Design an enzyme around this catalytic site. Structure first.
Site, PDB file in Angstrom:
ATOM      1  N   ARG A 248     -33.103   1.960 -69.803  1.00 17.30           N
ATOM      2  CA  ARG A 248     -33.514   2.884 -68.754  1.00 17.30           C
ATOM      3  C   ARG A 248     -33.443   2.186 -67.402  1.00 17.30           C
ATOM      4  O   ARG A 248     -33.103   2.795 -66.388  1.00 17.30           O
ATOM      5  CB  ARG A 248     -34.932   3.399 -68.994  1.00 17.30           C
TER       6      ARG A 248
ATOM      7  N   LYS B 259     -19.904  18.539 -61.195  1.00 19.64           N
ATOM      8  CA  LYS B 259     -18.780  19.299 -60.630  1.00 19.64           C
ATOM      9  C   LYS B 259     -17.561  18.452 -60.446  1.00 19.64           C
ATOM     10  O   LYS B 259     -16.951  18.052 -61.423  1.00 19.64           O
ATOM     11  CB  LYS B 259     -19.232  19.935 -59.337  1.00 19.64           C
TER      12      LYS B 259
ATOM     13  N   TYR C  32     -27.921  25.198 -52.377  1.00 22.43           N
ATOM     14  CA  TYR C  32     -27.813  25.607 -53.773  1.00 22.43           C
ATOM     15  C   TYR C  32     -29.158  26.113 -54.283  1.00 22.43           C
ATOM     16  O   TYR C  32     -30.200  25.533 -53.977  1.00 22.43           O
ATOM     17  CB  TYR C  32     -27.303  24.448 -54.637  1.00 22.43           C
TER      18      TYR C  32
ATOM     19  N   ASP D 169     -25.836  16.182 -49.384  1.00 23.08           N
ATOM     20  CA  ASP D 169     -25.357  16.629 -50.682  1.00 23.08           C
ATOM     21  C   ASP D 169     -23.857  16.851 -50.565  1.00 23.08           C
ATOM     22  O   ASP D 169     -23.400  17.879 -50.066  1.00 23.08           O
ATOM     23  CB  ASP D 169     -26.085  17.898 -51.122  1.00 23.08           C
TER      24      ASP D 169
END
Lengths: 387, 388, 384, 386
Positions: free
Chosen positions: D50, D200, D102, D175
């Site tokens: 992690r 994306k 978004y 972003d």
């Protein structure tokens, strides 16, 4: 009264080939190396097909579990079978067991035989008959024990012994049913221990793979050559997944034994079962042989249901836990009718002789709760034969 | 002046076999189905066992078939596995005609393994058509050609060769189309019976999948191959099938860049004072350059060349590369460099390499998708390093 | 003398969510669906829900005896998501001996968005009630604790906590697994896991799991699963679901091996003290038998001598690997003072009993002899 | 007139982090390391997955180069990256977010972050003086999107960076999901954080959900690196491998997205059944000249309004045979979608102010053949307005 369990199996299955000092990260679990090629120039790897890290880790692990020095992984059990057969020349002969896996039967009889190879199907349960089939042209003997699905058991040590009297004859044992946890053909005199890792070895019904373990140095060199030359190699991801499955082979096979034994005992005392075939049962013709060459039994339970083809179908279609499907050795319970399914690839006139009637059912008992497996069988048998 | 590009290629590579209505979830990308076995006999059935067929492999095969302009396709564990499976179509007593210059492993299988099972093997230069005609016998069932060849990149007239082979009897012509890819060459459209690939290279294009592909039109030929795929079991992993299908999604834009990068590299090397000779189908200097333009819609990133001097000069060059990686294989996004005489074709007799021209100064380049400027810079400095 | 094993556990672990009738191919094993999106004109977007993750969630819910379950990118991610259920201004009662990362999140991060955190020994019935305020909305407990393995009576704790009504009781059930302990059946509101440990059990998946029965609690959790997006990969979901299939046979061997290791260490002249719930020497051994169906492979012990002796022991092991984390098929060994609990303040480390000589073992599935022989040889190296 | 393409991009995307000398096997492509833990004892190496692991680090090392960044952090999803970045703040601070963002970004700030002592103001940052009117000393974070989703409004990043950094300590996050680091580098324009939804364009193969955060500032990275391990919204190593694999073809994908996107945009504008087309590559775009100064090109994201009513939008979408009616974007396959009901249903009075009507359609133009993509749109439009 079985053979004592192999002494370092669980330890080796978890650590052999898994040494963290192999990787720059010192990862406790070996990374998945997808890479087809490797940098050369300044030892090591050249091309994935010849060898790659993840596959090598698997091969070293399986070798240990077989008590072997070497092991080779393949795209499938059949791929392993075909590769082994490529050791021979045009003009040689292969003696094969009469009750073998359908695909094995199909390859020898329909494909291999048309390349200057002679194929003889011989009842090797009659060890006295094997000697009569052997000729100076015999170069390979292919044995499977227990057989699929009538589960007749062959004396490997006796067979290896007969085979090795005539010089260079190869004895191969298809050890798919048992696994190296329960049976070690190489320790019993075999030259090659072969697996369909698709079954018990991976044990998770999500990997198609073959495995071949060997001790003879020259035989390994010939096998290692064919592995790279024919190229029927497994994916590194499949190798990792299979290696992951091996990590629990010992705890999986034990539960298969406990569940398999329980199912077999339930079925044998059940009024709607004509006959049960299970090596762990004293009623098995070779029960005492099994105990001498094996350390236990698996979850493969074969039985005849009373009645006709009609009853077998109603039984199979009413199961809720056993899934009607082919293959075996997974964590999930499977049920199947060889006459119509897995052994439709064996000739009808040969099925009548082998005992594969319309009422023979093969079960692959999984790792579910025993209670539930018996309850499922009880309810399904009552559907075929109601009170 | 090349052949016009194949229509709907990109569209089909992305959509054929990827139809969302196959799945209950209507997923745009096909799931990876690992399951070895499938449930049978339920109220209201295609699959039985993974080796015989499975969802993810089938989607890939349907897609590759489209890109080849084929009816059928079969995926395998490797290129060699595809080759060996194809050979299993024959009987003891048949003869195989193989191109004299082919990939070492193709050479090795025929010469050392196939020859051990009642098969007669003759290596014949199939670029010169009279040599093929004399080797054909009433017993001939298979002709195996590769174009361009590995690694001398000899070009064979496929349509012309098919014409000679399909004349007298039932003989199969197989074209190893690994080098070109179906984006640049369609052997089946040129008369071949089988278009065969090592998907390990350009098809997947990402150096992380070992796989073979076999495309075919003949119905009886397919059925014989489909039988052997399941009977011999040289099957690919479903996860590998998924990854290869993923690689296919960008095959068209990759091959275009392989072409543009490959041409620049070839042109750079031929004008370089430390290079003896360059072999690249896109160059007019290639003996069969005009043939290439007739059979192909372009060229790939495979550039073969001879360095001046001897083996010692070739080694200094290879060890000075910083972008090109000294390694085997080809067709990936990364640039590779290699010395075939010692490496990929060491499995070919010393006496055959001299006949074929595979000397110690022959270098094969697999030009990748990196920036053009930088690849030229690496080759230049390394050549300056080899001959300071 | 333990609680009877949970009925249909193995059956449910293998079959729940795994129904072949879900797929047009009727595959016995669910496919890995990586697709981020789905055609509309069911599923909409992978983060909101997807076939492979959903199959896993149905399975874990059953094993927990739960109605719902949510998978997350990690154990800590599950914790953070649960904490997002609360309001600006509230307090969290958390056990003083918890996993280091859990401590760190509450103490150093969560406290900065109007959340108040108080670390309380929740075993002391009188210390917990005194710590509860009308403003408390969440109580976070872990049992057994890491690594001193302190055991909490869950149901009385649930009883004490729910007297104040709408307070959430979460039990971090990472150590035991749902095969050995069911917090939800004992009155807990949320059964939380780090699937990175025993659940997956193969040391190759980082994942968190959250099981719940309450309808309102589930809807709030499900909203947050999609809104924060700390979701697991479908491949990880598949791998964890694959691991779940052998959880019952794994935990049984962990139990058998852990018991053997614990007993060997206790009769050993070079060991000062052993802490293992399966041993009668454990102070709450009988509580364990009443709320659990068995014990795991976590064995804690104090070696005789100093930090130097613990280090010589750890570095001479050949089977046990000196590493952090736990619950895998392989045996791991670790010194919490220096390693996994370096993220807890030092003087509280001393009060909990995590000295420089406390050693934590995660006993794997290897052969018993080899594990014992490795421990013997390593102890003989420290104390010849 | 666009910015010259970022140099050595293809070389770096293929080679950075991919050095074969990292592995004892000398593999050309990095192995997938699933192992959660690592052997300690013998300074060197990893402790826990992690916190960090080989395959994730290689991706992060690679993405950093493409962003022209010094550091990068991978996350379980784009939203996972967003939530982590927001955890940099404390209760009482205020966040400036773009007014057209978004749906999920809107939802987190408005419904979740707002319940933890955070002040959130939605501001039209394309008109940059509105940014100054909302700024308070309580401002610690500015979150912008360019082009916006889905109205594709373009923001002058360096201009915003100038205004944002004038006042003490405000973090500017861009972003950069729509554009790719191949087409836009926010950090080179003054941004503090370059953030991606790797789901994306970055991965580009519609099979990985992942978020990415690239950064230059030393203190900012250290705070983020702490949160990556402390909050634990980490991606799977296999997903990391897959995204890194997708990255290898990002440049040739983005170029084809451009050529197809431009053609699609040009086709729609000359079409008698389209009321208005919004595409940064078109001269009709209000900030077209701005795009050319801060970008090296445009993507395959084409937004447009269809003529008529909601029913006409439905018939169009339902008659597409190549475009797939689905959410998400940036994949090799062409996607079509109606934001009002789908991807931005989580934003209604705000949709009317932003211009996201019932007739607004968002397209993600893929890597299929241009002709086939054009014919599909042509036939489908003829179907809605018969």
């Amino acid at each position: 009264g079985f053979l004592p369990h192999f002494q370092h199996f669980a330890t080796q299955a978890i650590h052999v080939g898994q040494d963290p000092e192999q990787w720059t990260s010192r990862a406790v679990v070996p990374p998945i190396s997808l890479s087809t090629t490797f940098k050369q120039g300044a030892s090591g790897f050249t091309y994935s097909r010849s060898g790659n890290p993840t596959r090598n880790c698997l091969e070293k692990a399986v070798a240990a579990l077989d008590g072997a020095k070497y092991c080779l992984a393949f795209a499938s059990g059949l791929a392993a079978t075909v590769t082994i057969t490529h050791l021979l020349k045009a003009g040689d002969q292969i003696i094969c067991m009469d009750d073998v896996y359908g695909g094995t039967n199909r390859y020898f009889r329909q494909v291999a035989s048309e390349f200057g190879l002679k194929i003889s199907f011989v009842d090797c349960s009659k060890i006295k008959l094997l000697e009569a089939a052997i000729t100076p042209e015999t170069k390979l003997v292919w044995i499977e024990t227990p057989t699929n699905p009538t589960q007749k058991v062959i004396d490997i040590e006796g067979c290896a012994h007969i085979v090795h009297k005539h010089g260079d004859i190869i004895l191969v044992v298809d050890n798919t049913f048992m696994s190296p946890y329960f049976q070690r053909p190489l320790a019993l005199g075999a030259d090659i221990s072969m697996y369909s890792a698709t079954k018990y070895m991976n044990g998770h019904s999500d990997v198609v793979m073959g495995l071949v373990s060997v001790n003879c140095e020259s035989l390994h060199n010939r096998l290692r050559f064919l592995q790279n030359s024919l190229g029927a190699v497994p994916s590194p991801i499949d190798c990792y997944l299979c290696n992951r499955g091996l990590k629990t082979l010992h705890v999986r096979m034990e539960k298969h034994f406990k569940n398999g034994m329980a199912v077999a005992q339930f079925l044998e005392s059940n009024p709607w079962v004509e006959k049960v075939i299970y090596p762990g049962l004293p009623s098995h013709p070779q029960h005492e042989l099994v105990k001498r060459q094996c350390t236990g039994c698996t979850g493969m339970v074969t039985f005849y249901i009373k009645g006709t083809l009609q009853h077998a179908e109603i039984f199979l279609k009413n199961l809720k836990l056993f899934t009607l499907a082919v293959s075996l050795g997974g964590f999930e319970s499977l049920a199947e009718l060889p006459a119509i399914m897995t052994h439709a690839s064996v000739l009808k006139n040969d099925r009548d002789v082998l005992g594969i009637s319309d009422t023979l059912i093969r079960l692959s008992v999984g790792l579910e709760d025993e209670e539930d497996l018996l309850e499922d069988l009880d309810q399904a048998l009552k559907a075929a034969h109601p009170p």
